[PDB]
Every structure is written in structure tokens, then in C-alpha cells.
């Protein structure tokens, strides 16, 4: 039957809505209906229909011919309403039909490319990947000379578009058939005397071969370079520019190997540096920039000193592409190991910071990124202070964006190298420009925050003399009432608390502590979350007695915030409660801790994982401080009331208490709940036991004999679910105690799990199988094979199915281990069934 049709699919699958007998009306070449269904089964349909129709159209690919195939496929690939996945399917079927039709696709090659080549420039990266893919498969199906003869006339076309896409297509077929297969075509076209557009197109083929192939060029690098190197002295400026750009592309793809292949290109380039201007000089300089890192140390010194004059001259070019090119080249030169830092400090830095660090460069985002990253890469070689000093004074500029640029630059520099390079003067200059640049903020630039915290943490104990001033500015900023600056200041406190502890200014963190405490009534949730984060950051480093908001007063103020709906407030608040729980331990009523505990219990079901982790951890801390006895009784009471709908969180709580405090404390009670006659609570304690053992894992090695009888009577048939979840308990115990010497107890429970091997309900039988696999890893495949050998050749078939199934579970896992456990089976008349090698004795 036909699947669902979309409105845009009527244009391509209209002739299937009418039922006609195919044989009655079967004109030769009107069997398209056939392929139609297959195609309509691939685009719209389930995976089985797609694979079935796929294999059907690949087997009959020769019979159908390329004509109908592509004549019906290309319109679908051309439909504007085509989804990306549908297009992927059309690509795969295009490949799988191209593989069968080896030579038949030649007369249609052109008709394919005019439909496909646009995809090589589509905005969608995946569409470009698919276009390259099917062009490659087309280059393998048809011959090399077929693609060459098909795409050659478009080489010297007058339109730049078709030359560009043609060059990219030739790069694709170069990747499909290998560089050597297309080497002679490029050697011929790149020296064509017919027109310059041909040589330009071929050189573009070299460039796109560089970009596309990448590091796979290195073997053929000298071949391509020797094919292309002549274009640097041609009378046409366009072919010189594209030749230098393709040299730069080859150098980029060959990084960091392959300096020898560019040998015959080093001197021309250099020469051109003295006699070229405009964007051709930009291409030459770009090639030099991508070529210098490939060189050795001494030759990098020689060449860099040989081009640095013209480079410095072009530091002040009016063109923007020139400025960005020479900036990238500066980064590339000053990244090379051969360029000593003294030379850069003498001849490079003064014009660099004179001409490039202007106010007009901080406005363009591209100039921003290029200048900042280039400057940090300079700092990585010439030193931290040597760069920071030249831009510290600009931290006090009136233009805020310039302060953003220099602040980010110094932030990354000090984040990379550190503060050991900084003297006293540059230190005080840093704190000055950072304070001033942080005080007059029009918005809430995170760059100023990262810069402040980064420089403070970098100075470490060197910031102690400035902490009163810093905390004053942080307080004034904290009371600005622009809610986001209160948030930002709280974040800064949270980032610098650890350094404030190591500077002997605990009382200052006290003032910050009470000031932050007097802000928990905040309405804006994000700001409140930052406040709680700063409080948690101070509590962790300060002693519990030196907390200016005493915990006796602090915690009950945090208890109502746990009802906040925002996820950030919940996470930070819970985390603070847990820090007080683990470290503060006391100072709150056991009933108060309890109240907190049962406020937190629902938050185990939180949607965000971080909140779940925090809730688990703090619940563990408060369970350690309180003790298991009182809380466990209320959890056991909560297992019965509000059952099935909200008991899972109480189960997690029982496992948590069983972990932080030894399960010696809570397991006996859990036993007591099992006795009562009501059956659903039996399932409650069974489930809770499964999650308990799965959670504690290895701690259950000393608590198996205690739960053995419960799993004996429970595991022996009372209720179907009883045996289900009880087998689950056996599985979790087996996996948790695996490798801790409990083969006797688990081996004993095996004798009770095994009677339940024959069962029909899927859930309980899959639980039993899982228990058998856990007992396989914890007991060993030997015992499992022993239990499994009896019914492998049992006369009954219904037993052979189950025992063979178990044997499959034990064979897939630890197949190499079964070699030592296969029993001896004596050979009969027709066969030899004895492994004689294992009977050898030395």
C-alpha cells in the first residue's frame, strides 16, 4: 500500500493515485510507475520500507537504466520543499544506483552536474557535504576522461560564478580519484595559452584541492606546487593573486610539515614583496604568513627579517583586508619558534601598538577578535608584562568599548601566563585601571567581570593591600539598584572569596556576609541566585564561628527560599544548606533539620539534573548530622501514604540514608515493614530494596545474609510482581557485590531464582534473565553453564527454547571464559568430539 502523501509530493507522485493494471497499459519506458513506488517508498515510509525499496532499486538498477532513474530523481532533489533528511535519502539512493551503473551514467554526467553543483555553495554545510558526495560517486562511476570532457568547456567561461563552481567541482573529483589522476589536467590547464581565465580556473582548482584535501596533500605537495608556481610572474594580476592565495592554502593544509616543496617559491614571493601593491601584495603577504611557520629557526629569522620592513610599511594601509591579512601574518610570525622575542620587542611592537591599537579598531567585531587574539599570542612569546604595560593606561579611556577590548586582552593574557611577570608599578596600574573600568559601566559586561576576577585570582595574596578599596567598590556597586549589577557584584564576590580567605581579611568578608544576608528578600530570581552563590562562596572558606550572619540565624532564613520556583535559586540555596549541613553540622534544631529534609524530598524529582545532584548531596549531609533513626521512621510512614505516585523520591531518600549512614541502621526496619499483610507495601519494600542495593553497590557485601530470607519467601511465588522485583533485587545485589567474595550467598539465591526461569509475563521473565546475567558476572560463567547444561538437550522443545536462550545470554558475555568449562563429550563413530590439546600433560 502507499504511504502518506504531502501536498508537494503530488507534483512527483501523481500517477499512483489512479489504479491501472500495469500490464494492460505498459508502454515501453512507462514502467516508471515501478520506480515511482520505490522512490515514493524511500522518501515517505518506515525504515523497513526504505531498506526494502532501496535493495529493490539497487538490484534492478541495471535493468531500469540511468535515463528513467535520474530523469525522475533530479526533480525531487530540486524541489524547494525538500527536507534535509529526505535529501540525505535521495543522496544515498543516488550513490547505490551509481555503483551499479558503471558506464551508463556517462551520457547523463552533464545533466547531473547542472543540478548538483549549486549544492557546493549552499549555506547548509550538510548540503555541501552531500553535493561533494554525489559528485565523487559520479566521478567514480563515470571515467576520469568523462568528467574532464564534461567539465572542460566551463573552464574558460566568461562568468566568474561558473568558473568558481567548476573549480570546486574539479577539486571534488580530485578528491574522488586522487591527486595523481588529475595532475596532468592541472599541469596543462595552468599553462594554457588560450586565455588567462583557464589558468586562473586551474589555479583555483589547486586552491580548492588544498582546502578540501587538507593534510592528505603532503605526498603530492611538490607536484602541485611545481604545477602552480609559474603563476606568480604572469602578466595577469588576477592569476598572480589567485596563485599566491593557492600557495597560502597549500601551506595552510600542509602545516606544520612540507617546507621543502615550497623551495622554488620562496625567492619569487620575496621578490614580489618589493614590486607589488594592492590586493596582489595582500595575497603574497598572506602566502608568506602561512609559509613562515613551516620553516626552521634560522631561516625563519632570515625570511622574517627579510619581509618585516614591507610588513611594517603595510601596518598603516588604508585597506581593511590588508590590515587583517598583515595582522594574521604578525601572529603567524610571532608564533614561530625561530623569531626571538627580542627582535619582536625591538622592531615589531612599537609600530604594532602605534598603528593597530586605535579607537576605530574596537568598533568592528572582526578587527576586535583579530587584534585581541593576535595580541594574546604576542604575550605568549614576548612576555606578559611587556604587552600588558602598553595597554594598561588605555583602561581609563572614555570610550567603553576600548576598555572592553583592553580588558579582555589583559584578562586572557594574565589567564595564560599569570602574574609572576608583573612588577609593582604595573600591578598598581592594573588595580587602578580595573577599578576605574569597572566603576563606570553602562551595562553589565561579563568581560569586566572575568577580567576583575581573573586579575584578582592571578595576583592572589598580592591583592591584600587593595582588598578594603575593592570591597568598598563592590559594596557601592552592590547597592546600585540596577538589578543586574547586584547580580554581577555577587558573582564577583563568589569568584574572589577564595582569594579573600588567603589574604587575612576575614572581617571584610564579614561585612560582605551581613550585606549579602540582608538581600535574601530579593524578588528578581537570578539576582537572588547570585546572592546565594556569594554566600555559599564565603561560607566555604570562612569558619563557622566567624560568619557575621550566625548560622543559628542564617539557616532558618534559608529554609523558606527552598520553595522558590527558579532553578538557579533552588540549586544555590540547596548547595548552601548542604555546606551548612556538612560543615556547620549543629546550630539548628533536629526538628528544624527534619523540616528541611522533608522540604527537600520532592526536589529529588526535579527536572534539572544539577538540582537533583545538589538535593541528593545535602540530603546525605543532613542525614549524617541527624542520624537515621528518626528520619527513617517518617520515610517508612511516607512509603505507605501517597503510594505509587510520589513514593519514588522516598525510595531515593531511603537509599541515601542507607548510604551516608550504614545500612545496618535502616535495613532491619525495612525488614519490619515487609511483615505486614497488605501486599502493595510488600512491593514497596521490594522496590526500595532493589534501588537500595543498586545504589549502595559494594556496601551490600556485608548485608546479603540479612536480606536472604526476605528474598527467599518473597522470591518463592507469592505474587508475580513479588518474583519480578525480587529478581531485580538479586540482579542489583549481584552487580553491586561483584568481585567481593560472596559466591556462597548469591549461589544460594540462584537455587531460588532458577525455579522462576519458566514464566510467560515479559517483565518478570526479563527481570529473571537480568538476574541471571548479574549472577553470571558475580558468580562466574562456570556455575551458570552448569545450571544451563541440563535443558540444552532436553527432550521437550519448550524447555530447549528457554535453556538455549539462557545459554545465549551466557555465551554472548564471556565467550572466551567458556573454553575452560565445556564438559568432556566423547567422540562417536562419525566425528571427533574430544579436545586433545587440553589433555596434554608436561
Amino acid at each position: 500500500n502507499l504511504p502518506f502523501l504531502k501536498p508537494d509530493d503530488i507534483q512527483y507522485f501523481d500517477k499512483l493515485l489512479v489504479d491501472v493494471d500495469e500490464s494492460t497499459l505498459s508502454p515501453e519506458e512507462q514502467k516508471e510507475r515501478k520506480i515511482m513506488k520505490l522512490l515514493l517508498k524511500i522518501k515517505n515510509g518506515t525504515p523497513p520500507m526504505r531498506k526494502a525499496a532501496l535493495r529493490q532499486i539497487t538490484d534492478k538498477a541495471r535493468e531500469f537504466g540511468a535515463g528513467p532513474l535520474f530523469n525522475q530523481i533530479l526533480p525531487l532533489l530540486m524541489s524547494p520543499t525538500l527536507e534535509d533528511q529526505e535529501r540525505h535519502l535521495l543522496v544515498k539512493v543516488i550513490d547505490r544506483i551509481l555503483y551499479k551503473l558503471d558506464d551508463l551514467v556517462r551520457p547523463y554526467v552533464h545533466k547531473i552536474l547542472v543540478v548538483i553543483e549549486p549544492l557546493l555553495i549552499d549555506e547548509d554545510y550538510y548540503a555541501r557535504v552531500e553535493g561533494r558526495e554525489i559528485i565523487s560517486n559520479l566521478a567514480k562511476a563515470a571515467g576520469l576522461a568523462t568528467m574532464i570532457s564534461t567539465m572542460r568547456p566551463d573552464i574558460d567561461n566568461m562568468d566568474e560564478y561558473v568558473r568558481n563552481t567548476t573549480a570546486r567541482a574539479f577539486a571534488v573529483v580530485a578528491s574522488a580519484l586522487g591527486i595523481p589522476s588529475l595532475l596532468p589536467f592541472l599541469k596543462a590547464v595552468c599553462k594554457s595559452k588560450k586565455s588567462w581565465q583557464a589558468r586562473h580556473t586551474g589555479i583555483k582548482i589547486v586552491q580548492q584541492i588544498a582546502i578540501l584535501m587538507g593534510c592528505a596533500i603532503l605526498p603530492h605537495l611538490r607536484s602541485l606546487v611545481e604545477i602552480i608556481e609559474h603563476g606568480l610572474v604572469d602578466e595577469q594580476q588576477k592569476v598572480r593573486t589567485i596563485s599566491a592565495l593557492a600557495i597560502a592554502a597549500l601551506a595552510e593544509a600542509a602545516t606544520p610539515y612540507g617546507i621543502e616543496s615550497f623551495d622554488s617559491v620562496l625567492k619569487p614571493l620575496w621578490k614580489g614583496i618589493r614590486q607589488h601593491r594592492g590586493k596582489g601584495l595582500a595575497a603574497f603577504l598572506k602566502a608568506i604568513g602561512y609559509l613562515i611557520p613551516l620553516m626552521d629557526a634560522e631561516y625563519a629569522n632570515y625570511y622574517t627579517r627579510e619581509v618585516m620592513l614591507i610588513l611594517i610599511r603595510e601596518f598603516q594601509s588604508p585597506d581593511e583586508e590588508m590590515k587583517k591579512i598583515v595582522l594574521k601574518v604578525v601572529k603567524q610570525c610571532c608564533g614561530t619558534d625561530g623569531v626571538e622575542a627580542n627582535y619582536i620587542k625591538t622592531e615589531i611592537l612599537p609600530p604594532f601598538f602605534k598603528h593597530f591599537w586605535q579607537h576605530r579598531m574596537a568598533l568592528d567585531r572582526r578587527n576586535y577578535r583579530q587584534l585581541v587574539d593576535t595580541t594574546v599570542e604576542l604575550a605568549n612569546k614576548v612576555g606578559a608584562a611587556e604587552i600588558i604595560s602598553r595597554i594598561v593606561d588605555d583602561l581609563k579611556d572614555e570610550a567603553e568599548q576600548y576598555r572592553k577590548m583592553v580588558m579582555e586582552t589583559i584578562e586572557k593574557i594574565m589567564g595564560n601566563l599569570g602574574a609572576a611577570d608583573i612588577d609593582h608599578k604595573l600591578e598598581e596600574q592594573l588595580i587602578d585601571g580595573i577599578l576605574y573600568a569597572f566603576q563606570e559601566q553602562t551595562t553589565e559586561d561579563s568581560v569586566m567581570l572575568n577580567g576583575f576576577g581573573t586579575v584578582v585570582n592571578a595576583l592572589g595574596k598580592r591583592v591584600k593591600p587593595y582588598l578594603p578599596q575593592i570591597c568598598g567598590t563592590v559594596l557601592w556597586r552592590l547597592n546600585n539598584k540596577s538589578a543586574k549589577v547586584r547580580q554581577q557584584a555577587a558573582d564577583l564576590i563568589s569568584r574572589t572569596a577564595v582569594v579573600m580567605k588567603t589574604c587575612q581579611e576575614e572581617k571584610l568578608m564579614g561585612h560582605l556576609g551581613v550585606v549579602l544576608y540582608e538581600y535574601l528578600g530579593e524578588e528578581y530570581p537570578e539576582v537572588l541566585g547570585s546572592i546565594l552563590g556569594a554566600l555559599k562562596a564565603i561560607v566555604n572558606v570562612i569558619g563557622m564561628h566567624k560568619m557575621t550572619p550566625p548560622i543559628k540565624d542564617l539557616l532558618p532564613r534559608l529554609t523558606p527560599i527552598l520553595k522558590n520556583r527558579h532553578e538557579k535559586v533552588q540549586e544555590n540555596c540547596i548547595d548552601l544548606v548542604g555546606r551548612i549541613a556538612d560543615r556547620g553540622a549543629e546550630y539548628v534544631s533536629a526538628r528544624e533539620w527534619m523540616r528541611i529534609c522533608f522540604e527537600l524530598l520532592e526536589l529529588l524529582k526535579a527536572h534539572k539534573k544539577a538540582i537533583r545532584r545538589a538535593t541528593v548531596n545535602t540530603f546525605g549531609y543532613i542525614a549524617k548530622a541527624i542520624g537515621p533513626h528518626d528520619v527513617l521512621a517518617t520515610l517508612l510512614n511516607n512509603l505507605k501514604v501517597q503510594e505509587r505516585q510520589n513514593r519514588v523520591c522516598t525510595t531515593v531518600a531511603i537509599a541515601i540514608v542507607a548510604e551516608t549512614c550504614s545500612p545496618f541502621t535502616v535495613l532491619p526496619a525495612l525488614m519490619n515493614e515487609y511483615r505486614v499483610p497488605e501486599l502493595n507495601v510488600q512491593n514497596g519494600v521490594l522496590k526500595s530494596l532493589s534501588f537500595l542495593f543498586e545504589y549502595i553497590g559494594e556496601m551490600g557485601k556485608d548485608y546479603i545474609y540479612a536480606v536472604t530470607p526476605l528474598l527467599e519467601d518473597a522470591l518463592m511465588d507469592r505474587d508475580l510482581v513479588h518474583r519480578q522485583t525480587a529478581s531485580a533485587v538479586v540482579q542489583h545485589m549481584s552487580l553491586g557485590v561483584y568481585g567481593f567474595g560472596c559466591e556462597d550467598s548469591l549461589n544460594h539465591l540462584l537455587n531460588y531464582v532458577w525455579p522462576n526461569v519458566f514464566e510467560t509475563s515479559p517483565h518478570v521473565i526479563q527481570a529473571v534473565m537480568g538476574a541471571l546475567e548479574g549472577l553470571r558476572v558475580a558468580i562466574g560463567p562456570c556455575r551458570m553453564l552448569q545450571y544451563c547444561l541440563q535443558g540444552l538437550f532436553h527432550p521437550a522443545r519448550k524447555v530447549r527454547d528457554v535453556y538455549w536462550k539462557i545459554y545465549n545470554s551466557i555465551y554472548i558475555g564471556s565467550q572466551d571464559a567458556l573454553i575452560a568449562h565445556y564438559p568432556r563429550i566423547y567422540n562417536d563413530d562419525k566425528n571427533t568430539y574430544i579436545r586433545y590439546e587440553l589433555d596434554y600433560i608436561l
Binding site: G780, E837, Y840
Partner: protein
Amino acid sequence: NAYTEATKAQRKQQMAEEMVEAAGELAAEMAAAFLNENLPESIFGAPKAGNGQWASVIRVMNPIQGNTLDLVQLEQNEAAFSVAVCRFSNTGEDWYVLVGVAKDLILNPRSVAGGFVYTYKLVNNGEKLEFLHKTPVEEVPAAIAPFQGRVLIGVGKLLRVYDLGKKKLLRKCENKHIANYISGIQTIGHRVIVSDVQESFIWVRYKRNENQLIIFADDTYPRWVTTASLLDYDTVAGADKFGNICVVRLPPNTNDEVDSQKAEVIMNYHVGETVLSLQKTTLIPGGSESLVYTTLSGGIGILVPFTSHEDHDFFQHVEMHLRSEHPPLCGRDHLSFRSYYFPVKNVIDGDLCEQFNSMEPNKQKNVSEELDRTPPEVSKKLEDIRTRYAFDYKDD
């Protein structure tokens, strides 16, 4: 696949006789160079032939020097697999050398024509072997052990109590309920431990009144045993063809009168290299007893008992930490590797633990601080094991 020196000599001579047959008269010269030169078999390899051929030699060698005291070249197709030196209760203090031999052993497919047991006089205080008698037997005897003035010999799956006679070794008792084949046998003063080739160890008692070998225990698991040693009157430590080591122990309250006792396994551990010798011994004077084993790959290892549960928990936590912070190099799971055929039971991998010194300093700090210690303390506590049981030459 070997010739004895005599057989090699006859085939070389015969090959010279065939060699002269060619019409040619340089055949006698080629036979001069050929017969004169017996190439060194150590470097140019030993001539090998025959799927059923063998070569066995008994040697009496002094361990102080390298001299061989006596040499006994056996027959062509005789292959010795067991040997022992002991006294007999019926004779005086004369030392006798029993050697278990096999006749026409063909492996793959396994088929044996016969077996022999040579008896030697070992006179001149262990410097020469004098032929006494050669007692034939049906199956290959690969196990000979001194037992209460007599000799236990394991011929095939039949464990027999043998006494010395002036003409042949008289069969005094026999037990044929052994599963497959006897690879080795060791006896404490009263009991008998036999190593089945495939069915682990078996525990047999010898009733002196009737000369009856009653099987009173066996193992719950099959084990391709290679060697073993009795750690005490109840436990046995055994090796594995698949490179495993185990310790199996009888129930504490047991007597040899009861039957069908299931011996519980108290130790499992995959070494990773096939072990062929276990020995409980002290390595240095003043140290403690260790279970030294050798391996088929030319390696020497030791198993060492813990003195307290605190150390057990300590090294165990070390194992757990290094299993995650220092995982095996080739992607293998350490716990699964040591649980190759049987799950690990009460063994800590000290080779993994000593890699604590190879980790990064931050990982040493984390693992050490998790144990409330410092990295140098962990390293010293690791060296303590070698100081107590192995070789430590530090002199303060």
C-alpha cells in the same frame, strides 16, 4: 618428535649406507665429512622426526657445580613423565629412584600403547643409578609420590598403592573412580590429594586395615590443573592451564570417614600467565612465609597473606582507586581481567597497586588524601610488603 642418541646414530649410519649406493668414489669422502661432523644441536637445532617418536633421559646432576653425576639414556619410544626419590618401609635406608614412563604415546588423537615404571638403586650416596627392575603397566603413569613407606602411583584414571618387590612392583591397592586422568598427586601425612587433568582436585583417604582408597571429597568446579601445593591439612593451592590460581578448602569440621564432601573455593585469581609451580617458602631469613609461584613465560611471582583487616581494606581501596585513575593501558578492565574465568575472591593486585608511583602527582595527592594519607606514606606502605616477604636491601 625426537630421536634418542642411539636411534639418531643408526639413522645417520643407515643414511651413509644409502648414500654410498649411488654409482659415483667421493661417496666415502662425503661420508667422512658427514659422519665425522655431528652439528651442535643447541644452535643448529635438534633433528626431529616421527609423530609417535620420543626421547627421554634420566640425569643425576650436582646442583653446586654443573657436572652431571649419572646419565641414563632410555629407549627410543619411551617418554618419562614422573619421578621421585624415597625410601621403602620393607627395605632398609636405601634410596630408590622410581621413574614413570610411557610407551608409544601418540597425542592428537590421544592413544597410548603402554607404560613402564623404572626402579633404580641410587648407590654411592646419590651419584650413580643401578638398574633394579622395570615394572610394566597398561596406561601412562604421570604421578609418583612417596606415601607411608610405599609409593602411590597414578596410572591413567587409576590411583594405585604400590609396594616394592624383588622382581616387580606389587599392586597393593587401586581406586578407579577418578574421572579423567591423573596429572599429579601430593600427600600430607595421612590424606591423599590427586590432581585430575580436567576435574580439579580430589580428596582420598587410605584405610590401612583393608588397603582401600576411599574418595571422601572433590571440587564443585572443574579445573584444568597444572600444579598445586598443600598449604595445610585442609587447604590446597592450585594452578590452572588457563593461567589461574585458586585456593580450595575443606569444611572445617570434617573427617575422612564421611563421603561426597563438596570442597569450597576460598580463593580465585587470574594471573594472566600459566603457572607451573607453587611453593610455600620463606624467601629471606627473618621474613614471613610467602607463596612463590613460577610461570610458563619465565616469570616469578608471589602471593602474600594479610596480617590484619585494616591493611586489607587499605590495599583494597588502593585497588579500587587505581582501577579508575590509572586504567590498564590497552583498554582492558582490570577487575574483568583478573576475573577472566572465575570472579576474583580475596586477592589484591599488587602489580596495579605499585603503579601508584607512576601516576601524576595530582592523582597521587587525590588517591592518598582519599585514604587520609600522603603519597610518600602510600609508597612506603607498599614497600613494606616487599620488606616483609621479598627483598629489601635498604640499610637506614
